[PDB]
Design a binder for this molecule. Structure first.
Ligand SMILES: CCCCCCCCCCNCCSC[C@H]1O[C@@H](n2cnc3c(N)ncnc32)[C@H](O)[C@@H]1O
Length: 270
Protein backbone atom coordinates (compact mmCIF):
# COMPACT_ATOMS: atom_id res chain seq x y z
CA UNK A 1 0.00 0.00 0.00
CA UNK A 2 1.49 3.28 -1.31
CA UNK A 3 0.52 6.84 -0.27
CA UNK A 4 -0.32 7.60 -3.92
CA UNK A 5 -3.00 4.88 -3.81
CA UNK A 6 -4.99 6.22 -0.86
CA UNK A 7 -4.58 9.66 -2.46
CA UNK A 8 -6.97 8.55 -5.23
CA UNK A 9 -9.92 7.85 -2.89
CA UNK A 10 -9.62 9.94 0.33
CA UNK A 11 -10.26 13.70 0.82
CA UNK A 12 -7.34 16.20 0.63
CA UNK A 13 -6.64 15.67 4.34
CA UNK A 14 -5.94 11.93 3.85
CA UNK A 15 -8.08 11.08 6.88
CA UNK A 16 -8.41 7.34 6.87
CA UNK A 17 -11.39 7.18 9.26
CA UNK A 18 -15.16 7.79 9.61
CA UNK A 19 -16.24 11.34 8.66
CA UNK A 20 -19.07 13.21 10.51
CA UNK A 21 -21.76 14.68 8.24
CA UNK A 22 -23.22 17.20 10.69
CA UNK A 23 -24.70 19.19 9.03
CA UNK A 24 -25.64 16.52 6.39
CA UNK A 25 -24.59 18.75 3.47
CA UNK A 26 -20.86 18.94 4.32
CA UNK A 27 -18.08 17.90 1.92
CA UNK A 28 -16.20 14.69 2.77
CA UNK A 29 -13.31 17.00 3.69
CA UNK A 30 -15.48 19.30 5.87
CA UNK A 31 -16.97 16.15 7.41
CA UNK A 32 -13.51 14.99 8.41
CA UNK A 33 -12.81 18.23 10.27
CA UNK A 34 -16.23 18.00 11.91
CA UNK A 35 -15.31 14.43 13.08
CA UNK A 36 -12.12 15.81 14.60
CA UNK A 37 -14.13 18.55 16.43
CA UNK A 38 -16.65 15.91 17.58
CA UNK A 39 -13.86 14.05 19.44
CA UNK A 40 -12.02 17.09 20.82
CA UNK A 41 -15.18 18.86 22.03
CA UNK A 42 -15.69 15.88 24.37
CA UNK A 43 -12.30 16.29 25.99
CA UNK A 44 -12.62 19.37 28.20
CA UNK A 45 -9.40 20.75 26.75
CA UNK A 46 -8.04 23.91 28.34
CA UNK A 47 -5.04 25.99 27.19
CA UNK A 48 -1.63 24.76 28.37
CA UNK A 49 -2.78 21.12 28.64
CA UNK A 50 -1.01 18.28 26.90
CA UNK A 51 -3.16 16.17 24.52
CA UNK A 52 -1.99 12.67 23.61
CA UNK A 53 -3.14 11.43 20.19
CA UNK A 54 -2.76 7.63 20.03
CA UNK A 55 -2.54 6.59 16.35
CA UNK A 56 -2.14 10.14 15.08
CA UNK A 57 -2.29 9.62 11.30
CA UNK A 58 -1.10 12.48 9.14
CA UNK A 59 -1.31 14.84 12.08
CA UNK A 60 -4.71 16.38 11.33
CA UNK A 61 -6.27 15.90 14.80
CA UNK A 62 -3.16 17.34 16.57
CA UNK A 63 -2.97 20.46 14.33
CA UNK A 64 -6.64 21.18 14.88
CA UNK A 65 -6.16 20.73 18.65
CA UNK A 66 -3.20 23.17 18.86
CA UNK A 67 -5.08 25.73 16.76
CA UNK A 68 -8.53 25.35 18.34
CA UNK A 69 -7.57 24.90 22.03
CA UNK A 70 -4.03 26.31 22.53
CA UNK A 71 -2.72 22.90 23.80
CA UNK A 72 0.61 21.04 23.61
CA UNK A 73 0.39 17.71 21.73
CA UNK A 74 2.19 14.39 21.50
CA UNK A 75 1.33 11.86 18.77
CA UNK A 76 2.10 8.17 18.49
CA UNK A 77 2.27 6.27 15.25
CA UNK A 78 3.90 3.06 13.96
CA UNK A 79 4.43 4.57 10.45
CA UNK A 80 7.55 6.55 9.33
CA UNK A 81 5.52 7.97 6.45
CA UNK A 82 3.07 9.43 8.98
CA UNK A 83 5.73 10.55 11.45
CA UNK A 84 7.69 12.80 8.98
CA UNK A 85 4.49 14.29 7.59
CA UNK A 86 3.19 14.99 11.13
CA UNK A 87 6.50 16.55 12.06
CA UNK A 88 6.31 19.01 9.17
CA UNK A 89 2.59 19.54 9.81
CA UNK A 90 3.37 20.39 13.46
CA UNK A 91 6.41 22.56 12.84
CA UNK A 92 4.27 24.76 10.50
CA UNK A 93 1.86 25.98 13.22
CA UNK A 94 2.13 29.51 14.62
CA UNK A 95 2.31 28.71 18.32
CA UNK A 96 4.75 28.48 21.23
CA UNK A 97 3.14 25.17 22.33
CA UNK A 98 5.25 22.04 22.24
CA UNK A 99 4.45 19.47 19.57
CA UNK A 100 6.10 16.09 19.35
CA UNK A 101 5.46 12.94 17.35
CA UNK A 102 6.98 9.64 18.29
CA UNK A 103 7.44 6.51 16.18
CA UNK A 104 6.31 4.04 18.79
CA UNK A 105 3.23 2.34 20.25
CA UNK A 106 1.22 3.19 23.35
CA UNK A 107 2.78 0.13 24.94
CA UNK A 108 6.06 2.01 25.30
CA UNK A 109 4.53 5.34 26.17
CA UNK A 110 4.51 6.27 29.82
CA UNK A 111 4.45 10.05 30.16
CA UNK A 112 1.91 12.20 32.11
CA UNK A 113 -0.62 13.85 29.72
CA UNK A 114 -3.90 15.57 30.42
CA UNK A 115 -6.25 14.12 27.80
CA UNK A 116 -6.24 11.33 25.23
CA UNK A 117 -7.78 11.01 21.71
CA UNK A 118 -7.56 7.80 19.60
CA UNK A 119 -9.45 7.56 16.27
CA UNK A 120 -9.56 4.06 14.72
CA UNK A 121 -6.24 2.71 15.94
CA UNK A 122 -7.93 0.49 18.57
CA UNK A 123 -8.74 -2.23 15.99
CA UNK A 124 -4.97 -2.97 15.85
CA UNK A 125 -4.46 -3.46 19.63
CA UNK A 126 -5.65 -7.05 20.11
CA UNK A 127 -8.30 -8.27 22.56
CA UNK A 128 -5.35 -9.65 24.63
CA UNK A 129 -4.02 -6.13 25.28
CA UNK A 130 -7.22 -4.23 26.16
CA UNK A 131 -6.66 -4.42 29.94
CA UNK A 132 -3.14 -2.98 29.66
CA UNK A 133 -4.31 -0.31 27.25
CA UNK A 134 -7.03 1.08 29.52
CA UNK A 135 -4.84 0.79 32.65
CA UNK A 136 -2.06 2.78 30.91
CA UNK A 137 -4.49 5.49 29.83
CA UNK A 138 -6.01 5.80 33.34
CA UNK A 139 -2.54 5.90 34.93
CA UNK A 140 -0.97 8.58 32.71
CA UNK A 141 -3.77 11.12 33.16
CA UNK A 142 -4.50 13.50 36.09
CA UNK A 143 -7.58 13.29 38.30
CA UNK A 144 -9.86 15.05 35.80
CA UNK A 145 -8.60 13.18 32.70
CA UNK A 146 -10.87 12.12 29.82
CA UNK A 147 -10.22 9.99 26.73
CA UNK A 148 -12.16 9.33 23.51
CA UNK A 149 -11.65 6.14 21.58
CA UNK A 150 -13.35 5.85 18.16
CA UNK A 151 -13.46 2.33 16.73
CA UNK A 152 -15.34 0.14 14.28
CA UNK A 153 -17.01 -2.74 16.07
CA UNK A 154 -18.88 -5.95 15.42
CA UNK A 155 -21.10 -8.16 17.60
CA UNK A 156 -20.42 -11.27 19.73
CA UNK A 157 -20.98 -14.40 17.55
CA UNK A 158 -24.26 -14.97 19.42
CA UNK A 159 -25.75 -11.49 18.89
CA UNK A 160 -29.81 -13.62 15.79
CA UNK A 161 -29.80 -11.72 12.45
CA UNK A 162 -30.09 -15.13 10.68
CA UNK A 163 -27.60 -17.99 10.39
CA UNK A 164 -26.89 -17.12 6.72
CA UNK A 165 -25.96 -13.46 7.34
CA UNK A 166 -23.87 -14.19 10.43
CA UNK A 167 -21.60 -16.78 8.76
CA UNK A 168 -21.20 -14.48 5.74
CA UNK A 169 -20.24 -11.48 7.93
CA UNK A 170 -17.69 -13.45 9.95
CA UNK A 171 -15.96 -14.29 6.65
CA UNK A 172 -15.96 -10.81 5.17
CA UNK A 173 -14.48 -9.59 8.46
CA UNK A 174 -11.76 -12.30 8.27
CA UNK A 175 -10.86 -10.87 4.85
CA UNK A 176 -10.56 -7.27 6.24
CA UNK A 177 -8.37 -8.35 9.14
CA UNK A 178 -6.17 -10.37 6.71
CA UNK A 179 -5.54 -8.62 3.42
CA UNK A 180 -6.63 -5.06 4.16
CA UNK A 181 -5.45 -4.55 7.78
CA UNK A 182 -3.23 -7.59 8.50
CA UNK A 183 -3.22 -8.56 12.21
CA UNK A 184 -6.34 -6.44 12.90
CA UNK A 185 -9.16 -7.52 15.23
CA UNK A 186 -12.58 -5.90 15.76
CA UNK A 187 -13.91 -5.47 19.27
CA UNK A 188 -17.52 -5.08 20.17
CA UNK A 189 -18.86 -1.93 21.80
CA UNK A 190 -19.55 -3.95 24.93
CA UNK A 191 -15.81 -4.88 25.19
CA UNK A 192 -14.83 -1.24 24.60
CA UNK A 193 -17.08 -0.10 27.45
CA UNK A 194 -16.28 -2.93 29.88
CA UNK A 195 -12.53 -2.80 29.70
CA UNK A 196 -12.75 0.96 30.42
CA UNK A 197 -15.03 0.36 33.40
CA UNK A 198 -12.63 -2.29 34.78
CA UNK A 199 -9.72 0.20 34.70
CA UNK A 200 -12.04 2.54 36.66
CA UNK A 201 -13.40 4.89 33.99
CA UNK A 202 -17.01 6.22 34.01
CA UNK A 203 -18.36 5.50 30.52
CA UNK A 204 -21.45 7.37 29.24
CA UNK A 205 -23.56 5.99 26.40
CA UNK A 206 -21.43 5.51 23.27
CA UNK A 207 -22.21 7.42 20.10
CA UNK A 208 -22.92 5.32 17.02
CA UNK A 209 -21.41 6.65 13.81
CA UNK A 210 -23.03 4.01 11.56
CA UNK A 211 -24.86 6.24 9.04
CA UNK A 212 -21.78 8.45 8.86
CA UNK A 213 -19.49 5.52 8.00
CA UNK A 214 -22.06 4.38 5.42
CA UNK A 215 -21.88 7.89 3.87
CA UNK A 216 -18.02 7.86 4.12
CA UNK A 217 -17.56 4.45 2.41
CA UNK A 218 -19.88 5.49 -0.41
CA UNK A 219 -17.82 8.57 -1.27
CA UNK A 220 -14.68 6.48 -0.89
CA UNK A 221 -16.07 3.70 -3.11
CA UNK A 222 -17.33 6.19 -5.69
CA UNK A 223 -14.08 8.18 -5.87
CA UNK A 224 -11.86 5.06 -6.22
CA UNK A 225 -14.33 3.66 -8.79
CA UNK A 226 -13.84 6.80 -10.92
CA UNK A 227 -10.05 6.27 -10.83
CA UNK A 228 -10.22 2.61 -11.94
CA UNK A 229 -7.49 3.29 -14.50
CA UNK A 230 -5.35 5.89 -12.69
CA UNK A 231 -5.22 3.52 -9.67
CA UNK A 232 -4.37 0.29 -11.51
CA UNK A 233 -1.15 1.73 -13.01
CA UNK A 234 -0.08 2.59 -9.45
CA UNK A 235 -5.88 -4.30 -11.03
CA UNK A 236 -5.18 -6.75 -8.19
CA UNK A 237 -4.97 -4.10 -5.44
CA UNK A 238 -7.83 -2.14 -7.07
CA UNK A 239 -10.42 -4.95 -6.97
CA UNK A 240 -9.30 -5.81 -3.44
CA UNK A 241 -10.10 -2.33 -2.08
CA UNK A 242 -13.35 -2.09 -4.05
CA UNK A 243 -14.47 -5.38 -2.36
CA UNK A 244 -13.43 -3.82 0.96
CA UNK A 245 -15.18 -0.45 0.49
CA UNK A 246 -18.44 -1.79 -1.10
CA UNK A 247 -18.43 -4.66 1.42
CA UNK A 248 -18.18 -2.48 4.57
CA UNK A 249 -20.86 -0.08 3.27
CA UNK A 250 -23.09 -3.11 2.76
CA UNK A 251 -22.49 -4.56 6.23
CA UNK A 252 -22.83 -1.17 7.91
CA UNK A 253 -26.14 -0.79 6.01
CA UNK A 254 -27.18 -4.30 7.10
CA UNK A 255 -26.32 -3.36 10.70
CA UNK A 256 -23.78 -6.20 11.02
CA UNK A 257 -20.93 -3.70 11.66
CA UNK A 258 -21.04 -0.49 13.67
CA UNK A 259 -18.68 2.32 14.66
CA UNK A 260 -18.52 3.64 18.19
CA UNK A 261 -17.19 6.85 19.69
CA UNK A 262 -16.72 5.97 23.36
CA UNK A 263 -15.85 8.56 26.03
CA UNK A 264 -13.97 7.61 29.24
CA UNK A 265 -14.13 9.81 32.33
CA UNK A 266 -11.83 9.55 35.31
CA UNK A 267 -13.69 9.85 38.73
CA UNK A 268 -12.51 13.46 39.10
CA UNK A 269 -13.57 14.65 35.58
CA UNK A 270 -15.70 17.83 35.16
C1 LIG B 1 -14.96 0.64 8.31
C2 LIG B 1 -13.86 -0.42 8.28
C3 LIG B 1 -14.27 -1.74 8.97
C4 LIG B 1 -13.35 -2.05 10.17
C5 LIG B 1 -11.94 -2.55 9.76
C6 LIG B 1 -10.85 -2.43 10.83
C7 LIG B 1 -10.46 -0.96 11.06
C8 LIG B 1 -9.06 -0.65 10.58
C9 LIG B 1 -8.56 0.67 11.17
C10 LIG B 1 -8.61 1.81 10.15
N1 LIG B 1 -8.64 3.10 10.85
C11 LIG B 1 -7.53 3.92 10.33
C12 LIG B 1 -7.09 5.03 11.28
S1 LIG B 1 -5.28 5.23 11.11
C13 LIG B 1 -4.51 4.00 12.26
C14 LIG B 1 -3.40 4.68 13.12
O1 LIG B 1 -3.15 3.97 14.36
C15 LIG B 1 -1.70 3.74 14.49
N2 LIG B 1 -1.48 2.59 15.46
C16 LIG B 1 -1.81 1.30 15.30
N3 LIG B 1 -1.47 0.61 16.40
C17 LIG B 1 -0.92 1.47 17.26
C18 LIG B 1 -0.37 1.41 18.56
N4 LIG B 1 -0.34 0.25 19.16
N5 LIG B 1 0.13 2.52 19.17
C19 LIG B 1 0.09 3.71 18.56
N6 LIG B 1 -0.42 3.79 17.33
C20 LIG B 1 -0.92 2.73 16.66
C21 LIG B 1 -1.17 3.67 13.04
O2 LIG B 1 0.22 4.03 12.99
C22 LIG B 1 -2.05 4.75 12.37
O3 LIG B 1 -1.52 6.09 12.50
Amino acid sequence: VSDDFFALFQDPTRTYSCAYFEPPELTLEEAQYAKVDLNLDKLDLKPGMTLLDIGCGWGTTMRRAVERFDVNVIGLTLSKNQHARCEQVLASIDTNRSRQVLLQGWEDFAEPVDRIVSIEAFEHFGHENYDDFFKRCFNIMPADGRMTVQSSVSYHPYEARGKKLSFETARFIKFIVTEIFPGGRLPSTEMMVEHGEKAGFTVPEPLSLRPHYIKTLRIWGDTLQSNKDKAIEVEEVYNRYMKYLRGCEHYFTDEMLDCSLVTYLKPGAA
